[PDB]
UniProtKB/Swiss-Prot annotation, chain D:
Family, per entry: Belongs to the herpesviridae major capsid protein family.
Binding partners and assembly: Homomultimer. Makes the hexons and eleven out of twelve pentons. Interacts with triplex proteins 1/TRX1 and 2/TRX2; adjacent capsomers are linked together in groups of three by triplexes, heterotrimeric complexes composed of one molecule of TRX1 and two molecules of TRX2. Interacts with scaffold protein; this interaction allows efficient MCP transport to the host nucleus. Interacts with capsid vertex component 2/CVC2. Interacts with the small capsomere-interacting protein/SCP.
Protein purpose: Self-assembles to form an icosahedral capsid with a T=16 symmetry, about 200 nm in diameter, and consisting of 150 hexons and 12 pentons (total of 162 capsomers). Hexons form the edges and faces of the capsid and are each composed of six MCP molecules. In contrast, one penton is found at each of the 12 vertices. Eleven of the pentons are MCP pentamers, while the last vertex is occupied by the portal complex.
Protein name, per record: Major capsid protein
UniProtKB/Swiss-Prot annotation, chain G:
Origin superkingdom: Viruses
Name of protein: Capsid vertex component 2
Self-association and partners: Heterodimerizes with CVC1. Interacts with major capsid protein/MCP and triplex capsid protein 1/TRX1 at the pentamer vertices. Interacts with the large tegument protein/LTP.
Location of region: Interaction with major capsid protein/MCP: 1-37
Source species taxonomy: Viruses, Duplodnaviria, Heunggongvirae, Peploviricota, Herviviricetes
Residues in coiled coil: none
Compartment list: Virion; Host nucleus
Functional summary from the UniProt entry: Capsid vertex-specific component that plays a role during viral DNA encapsidation, assuring correct genome cleavage and presumably stabilizing capsids that contain full-length viral genomes. Participates in the interaction between the capsid and the tegument through interaction with the large tegument protein/LTP.
Family: Belongs to the herpesviridae CVC2 protein family.
UniProtKB/Swiss-Prot annotation, chain H:
Subunit structure: Homomultimer. Makes the hexons and eleven out of twelve pentons. Interacts with triplex proteins 1/TRX1 and 2/TRX2; adjacent capsomers are linked together in groups of three by triplexes, heterotrimeric complexes composed of one molecule of TRX1 and two molecules of TRX2. Interacts with scaffold protein; this interaction allows efficient MCP transport to the host nucleus. Interacts with capsid vertex component 2/CVC2. Interacts with the small capsomere-interacting protein/SCP.
Location in the cell: Virion; Host nucleus
Signal sequence, renumbered to the chain: none
Protein name: Major capsid protein
Disulfide bonds: none
Family in the record: Belongs to the herpesviridae major capsid protein family.
Function, in words: Self-assembles to form an icosahedral capsid with a T=16 symmetry, about 200 nm in diameter, and consisting of 150 hexons and 12 pentons (total of 162 capsomers). Hexons form the edges and faces of the capsid and are each composed of six MCP molecules. In contrast, one penton is found at each of the 12 vertices. Eleven of the pentons are MCP pentamers, while the last vertex is occupied by the portal complex.
Gene that produces this protein: MCP
Originating organism: Human herpesvirus 2 (strain HG52) (HHV-2)
Curated annotation (Swiss-Prot), chain I:
Primary role: Self-assembles to form an icosahedral capsid with a T=16 symmetry, about 200 nm in diameter, and consisting of 150 hexons and 12 pentons (total of 162 capsomers). Hexons form the edges and faces of the capsid and are each composed of six MCP molecules. In contrast, one penton is found at each of the 12 vertices. Eleven of the pentons are MCP pentamers, while the last vertex is occupied by the portal complex.
Lineage: Viruses, Duplodnaviria, Heunggongvirae, Peploviricota, Herviviricetes
Signal peptide residues on this chain, from the entry's feature table: none
Protein name: Major capsid protein
Superkingdom, natural source: Viruses
Places the protein is found: Virion; Host nucleus
Portion of the full-length sequence here: 934 to 1031 of 1374
Length: 254, 49, 49, 589, 101, 49, 37, 49, 98, 49, 49
């Protein structure tokens, strides 16, 4: 494939001549894949063909995120609350900022979801909660999923972003918090990271972001003010595309 | 250096220099240093006054 | 062990200024420019050794 | 007394078998046990490192407005400069008493989880209590090491060794603290920029400027550069009265003296982890620390080529260094953002250099002697750096009114009488450099044509904020101190400003030179508090509390912290003392 | 003649032909009003760059008018000489007075 | 800009051993709210395209 | 004992957001099938 | 502004007075003394500067 | 035989080539300028600091132990605090035989 | 060593020759930092014999 | 100091150098700017009177 493209000066072998294609196919027959497939899920004849395999998944989830965020937030919403956290009397004026503070976050969350590397995205909770769901359309890698995540739909799994200052991720670990109108929170069972000690949405300067095997996720703000999102109505992952995705990202459990 | 208690230096060239640098000739300095289990076996000087 | 205490004894920083220990603490030189003395305060004070 | 009429002796060489075990660097359980029951947001000025962003030209007005909020909030962790001793030992007035745990370390309320070489504004919220590392012995706070104790150690090392003459420092201290200081002396320094070849070009300027300014003030002229003073020693030491010339040769001989005080206190042992014996002993021998003014590229070629070294991040464009061999008019791209440092300092620009230097190994160590030690011995807090608009500088360097001489006429000598002289009031228009030879009286004559042909030869683009980080050395690098950091900020094409003159519109306040405090050693009480357009609210926090813009290093993440820098702007002991004292404050731990 | 109140006029040929004796007066006697209807192709930071090669390459011109004044440029340092095999290459400290009557 | 609430207030005495059908509280800090600064994500100098 | 104020937790407590109408005409809310990244 | 307007007059007044007396001229006003230290630092003998 | 005493090791200068006229060649531990030897043009940079407090002399000229003057007379000179008048006789008395 | 070659290069041939072993161990006779009673104690003077 | 001590015995009675010839000679040794025409004349005269 070099000299048939070097003596012909064919810089990319999709620009290879049709007799120069098939005469190589008469010589070496395993090249029908990278020359005669309509849409191969791996890109034919590129160096970053495995890397461009990854970056699509980074893209295709963000649109599944970004058009689902607009879905539950179509017009003026009524979110009223979902958790049980009671106030002191002057503590409500803190939420007076949270009225004013609010809409700059949801850009910068999605900016940070853009802002991560996809290699650094696969260590976060949403990149593995989909793998807990693409294995449900198989145990995904690193076994970060607990033994009881696959039991109910009430076992969510969170990430934590910084609300104030810079909008930055404040975890290494997906922190899976079992959630019960109202419903109070409960942890699961169990080298030291600061923010990993609290309930989701329990205090200020924390954005809480959980997901499911059902892939109906939560965006939990401090004060109970949270809401489900049907990202399952926006995940468009084709199974023959996704079957090369899961097998590189699943682990056969004994 | 009589007992094992601590993570050593990761620069292992440094700590073995400082190994015998401290425990050159202490009256409380062992010869043939620490095995896995057991005491350091503090040596005996020839006389005590 | 019971009292969680420890007694100091006759000590200083110069053999020069240790000379004024063999006359009691009446005129014991406590302090020259940095050179400091602490007289014996113990049950062992004043005794044979 | 023993168990006889017998004497006994306990040294501190007695303490060899206890302080030298590898458990002094064993603080794993300490950070864990203090971590629970957290601390709130302690408005982390000195407890956070910022990565650099944009050029250095506007970097203040970033950090001025970025810390406009959490600066007047509370106080920094240090207040103990006002605290006397045993006021720390008492239960009130020191909430940070339960945070002082190790002699070799620090526990302070820093940022939570954001990785340090990144971001500008950290997310104020929950707090963390981690480490840094105490580098040298002087970092202990001044209620535990008395100020008089530092001079106590210093004077008694002063015996037996070479010292400055008591008369000659009065010339230096007058020079260092001269307000009406001729601003050519800041400009002509950046002209030579440490280039030896531009120096021996311009030797008549260097001859007369020191010669003229001596008659105004009995004082040295150009003295904020070790390289420049070093060049005056060799290549100029003939055509002067000895009284002037004694000042420079005593200055180097004292730097000669303060250099070989390390190795009288050393033992011959093997090379170790890349470093030498002396590098592990004292801070001035380790090449991972580099002086605040680096004109060549010898330092990072030593510094970044170390086993200790992690990611010297120059952040205007590309983070990692790649360098220049020589530099000229078309190479000094006067406003760029890449991070390339210039090597345009040596005598032989024809035998140029990008990888192989020209200087000895003690050359930067001599600068580390001259900058970190001697200038604070004359500072008492009052000196700060400057970032150079070389485009603005190289406008007005080559801007002189030197008329044509008549066929048969004499040499220009004196300004007020001779009409052909460049400093004559007929030749004085504003905004030219012989008016700046005239704003401070510096007799520089008609043969100044020899300058500009070499002013056109070599030039330098603009300064840049180089941030080199490093790991703890071989000998302190155990399995709980491996992840630790030492941030060491410094400028490449920068000049020190000794005397902050801002109660004068001759140089308007920050035209050529934006201030950029590179360290707490050089933090302008009158430079920075009198900056371009400026908040009045920080006036409290400027009179104390050295404003270090956090791209250039933090209060706790460097080698030199606040305890010694107050000690500089404190005890009135002699120059001979503080030189040895701060040196004795630089013994590693 | 380059107009100092529009940055779209400074080139290197227009400043090098101007002497440094005359560039003192032309900077202080201009119009204070900066104009902004014709910008610069190298940017406004590149217009300062185009100004300073115009000054630096003009330093040969102010020196060639004084070519009957100074001496020959002595080799300041070692390594700058042809015959090296018996005598070294000197370096002459140029602390003298460059002046020819 | 105040968030809506259905009820006004109560005042409950809470015995420490007598907590039954447990509930939790909300945490707000000690510093004044001028310090809890705005969420800032700046556009970097270089972009993807 | 312990002494603090108290409000009954109910699902009729709403915090009000506003929108600038261009919030969904953002570069990340409207992403094509492939990026320049 | 008017100081540097007449700064030569300030210079000659001081040194001519310095010829008669070993005394400083304009210490009656600190705002003036701020200026001579700032502006006339070249054209004075060091004995009165 | 035809040697000359260099007082000041001047290596902070490339005007004369560093050792052009005069190759350095230490003849004894009394005469070893720390800036002569270490800043010669062909000097190993792996042997910098050990050169500083050791008088490197090639053994064709004499080692330490077979010289008539050993290291202690050298070490008195560089380290003693006294002025040269007392320092004169103090090392002058250092030459009475055994 | 025997006097070898001319005098111009014998030091320069020496530093290439003796580069190996002279850095290997520290030589005996650099003990000038040792003090009295640091010497007469058995550690820190392995050369006490 | 002991090696300097008996010098202070022998320091009396014999010639002591002037104070002016102390610093003049010593500064000449420590003159880094020592002009090298003097070295070649010293080899020119070469002991020949």
């Amino acid at each position: 494939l070099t000299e048939a493209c070097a003596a012909e000066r064919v810089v990319r072998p999709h620009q290879l001549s049709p007799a120069a294609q098939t005469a190589l196919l008469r010589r070496f027959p395993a090249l029908e894949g990278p020359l005669r497939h309509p849409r191969p899920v791996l890109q034919p004849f590129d160096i970053a063909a495995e890397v461009a395999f990854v970056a699509r998944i980074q893209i295709a989830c963000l649109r599944a995120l970004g058009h689902s965020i607009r879905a539950a937030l179509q017009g003026g919403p009524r979110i009223f609350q979902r958790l049980r956290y009671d106030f002191g009397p002057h503590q409500s004026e803190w939420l007076g900022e949270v009225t004013r503070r609010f809409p700059v976050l949801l850009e910068n969350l999605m900016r940070a979801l853009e802002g991560t590397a996809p290699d650094a995205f696969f260590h976060t909770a949403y990149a593995l909660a989909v793998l807990a769901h693409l294995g449900g359309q198989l145990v995904p890698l690193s076994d970060d999923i607990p033994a009881r995540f696959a039991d109910s739909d009430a076992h969510y799994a969170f990430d934590y972003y910084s609300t104030s200052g810079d909008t930055l991720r404040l975890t290494n670990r997906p922190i899976a918090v079992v959630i019960d109108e109202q419903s109070k929170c409960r942890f699961m069972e169990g080298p030291h990271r600061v923010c990993e000690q609290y309930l989701p949405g329990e205090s200020y300067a924390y954005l809480c972001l959980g997901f499911n095997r059902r892939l109906c996720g939560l965006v939990v703000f401090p004060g109970g003010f949270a809401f489900t999102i049907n990202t399952a109505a926006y995940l468009s992952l084709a199974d023959p595309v996704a079957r090369a995705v899961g097998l590189r990202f699943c682990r056969g459990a004994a | 250096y009589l007992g094992r208690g601590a993570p050593p230096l990761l620069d292992n060239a440094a700590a073995v220099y400082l190994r015998n640098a401290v425990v050159a000739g202490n009256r409380l300095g062992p010869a043939q240093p620490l095995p896995v289990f057991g005491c350091a076996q503090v040596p005996r000087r020839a006389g005590m006054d | 062990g019971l009292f969680q205490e420890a007694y100091p004894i006759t000590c200083a920083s110069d053999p020069a200024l240790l000379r004024s220990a063999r006359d009691g603490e009446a005129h014991a030189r406590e302090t020259h420019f940095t050179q400091y003395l602490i007289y014996d305060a113990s049950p062992l004070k004043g005794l044979s050794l | 007394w023993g168990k006889d009429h017998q004497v006994l002796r306990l040294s501190m060489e007695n303490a060899v078998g206890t302080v030298c075990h590898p458990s002094l660097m064993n603080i794993d359980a300490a950070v864990g046990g203090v971590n629970h029951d957290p601390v709130e947001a302690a408005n982390p000025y000195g407890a956070y490192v910022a990565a650099p962003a944009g050029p250095g030209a506007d970097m203040q007005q970033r950090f001025l407005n970025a810390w406009r909020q959490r600066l007047a909030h509370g106080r920094v962790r240090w207040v103990a400069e006002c605290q006397m001793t045993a006021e720390q030992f008492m239960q009130p007035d020191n909430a940070n008493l339960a945070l002082e745990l190790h002699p070799a370390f620090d526990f302070f309320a820093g940022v939570a989880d954001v990785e340090l070489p990144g971001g500008e504004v950290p997310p104020a919220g929950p707090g963390a209590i981690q480490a840094t590392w105490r580098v040298v012995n002087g970092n202990l706070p001044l209620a535990l090491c008395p100020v008089a104790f530092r001079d106590a150690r210093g004077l008694e090392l002063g015996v037996g060794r070479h010292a400055m003459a008591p008369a000659t420092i009065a010339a230096v201290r007058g020079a260092f603290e001269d307000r009406s200081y001729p601003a050519v002396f800041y400009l002509l320094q950046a002209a030579i920029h440490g280039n030896e070849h531009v120096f021996c070009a311009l030797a008549r300027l260097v001859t007369q400027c020191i010669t003229s300014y001596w008659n105004n003030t009995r004082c040295a002229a150009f003295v904020n550069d070790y390289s420049l003073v070093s060049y005056i020693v060799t290549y100029l030491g003939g055509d002067l009265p000895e009284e002037c010339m004694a000042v420079y040769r005593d200055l180097v001989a004292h730097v000669e003296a303060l250099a070989q005080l390390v190795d009288d206190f050393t033992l011959p042992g093997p090379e170790l982890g890349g470093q030498a014996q002396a590098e592990l002993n004292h801070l001035m021998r380790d090449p991972a620390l580099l002086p605040p003014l680096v004109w060549d590229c010898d330092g990072l070629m030593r510094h970044a080529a170390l086993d200790r070294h992690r990611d010297c991040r120059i952040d205007a464009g590309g983070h990692e260094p790649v360098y220049a061999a020589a530099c000229n008019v078309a190479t000094a791209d006067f406003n760029r953002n890449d991070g390339r440092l210039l090597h345009n300092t040596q005598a032989r620009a024809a035998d140029a250099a990008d990888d192989r230097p020209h200087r000895p190994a003690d050359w930067t160590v001599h600068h580390k002697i001259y900058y970190y030690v001697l200038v604070p011995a004359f500072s008492r807090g009052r000196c700060c750096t400057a970032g150079v608009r070389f485009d603005r500088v190289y406008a007005t360097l080559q801007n002189m009114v030197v008329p044509e001489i008549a066929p048969g006429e004499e040499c220009p000598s004196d300004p007020v009488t001779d009409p052909a002289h460049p400093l004559h009031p007929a030749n004085l228009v504003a905004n030219t450099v012989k008016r700046m030879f005239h704003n401070g009286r510096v007799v520089v004559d008609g043969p100044a044509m020899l300058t500009l042909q070499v002013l056109a030869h070599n030039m330098a683009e603009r300064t840049t904020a180089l941030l080199c980080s490093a790991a703890p050395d071989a000998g302190a690098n155990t399995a709980s101190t491996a992840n630790m950091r030492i941030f060491d900020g410094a400028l490449h094409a920068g000049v020190l400003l000794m005397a902050p003159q801002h109660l004068d519109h001759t140089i308007q306040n920050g035209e050529y030179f934006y201030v950029l405090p590179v360290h707490a050693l050089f933090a302008g009480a009158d430079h920075v508090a009198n900056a371009p357009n400026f908040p009045p609210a920080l006036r409290d926090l400027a009179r104390h509390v050295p404003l270090v813009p956090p791209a250039l290093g933090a209060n706790y993440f460097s080698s030199i912290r606040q305890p010694v820098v107050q000690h500089a702007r404190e005890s009135a002991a002699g120059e001979n003392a503080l030189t040895y004292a701060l040196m004795a404050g630089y013994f590693k731990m | 003649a380059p107009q100092f109140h529009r940055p779209s006029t400074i080139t290197a040929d227009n400043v090098r032909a101007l002497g440094t004796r005359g560039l003192v007066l032309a900077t202080n006697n201009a119009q204070f009003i900066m104009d902004n209807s014709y910008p610069h192709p190298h940017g406004t930071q590149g217009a300062v760059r185009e100004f300073l090669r115009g000054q630096a390459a003009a330093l040969t011109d102010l020196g060639v008018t004084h070519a009957n004044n100074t001496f020959a440029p002595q080799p300041m340092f070692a390594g700058d000489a042809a015959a090296e095999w018996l005598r070294p290459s000197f370096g002459l400290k140029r602390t003298y007075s460059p002046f020819v009557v | 800009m105040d968030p809506y609430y259905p009820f006004d207030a109560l005042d409950v005495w809470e015995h420490r051993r007598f907590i039954v059908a447990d509930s939790r509280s909300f945490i707000t800090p000690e510093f004044p709210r001028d310090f809890w600064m705005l969420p800032v994500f700046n556009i970097p100098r270089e972009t993807a395209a």
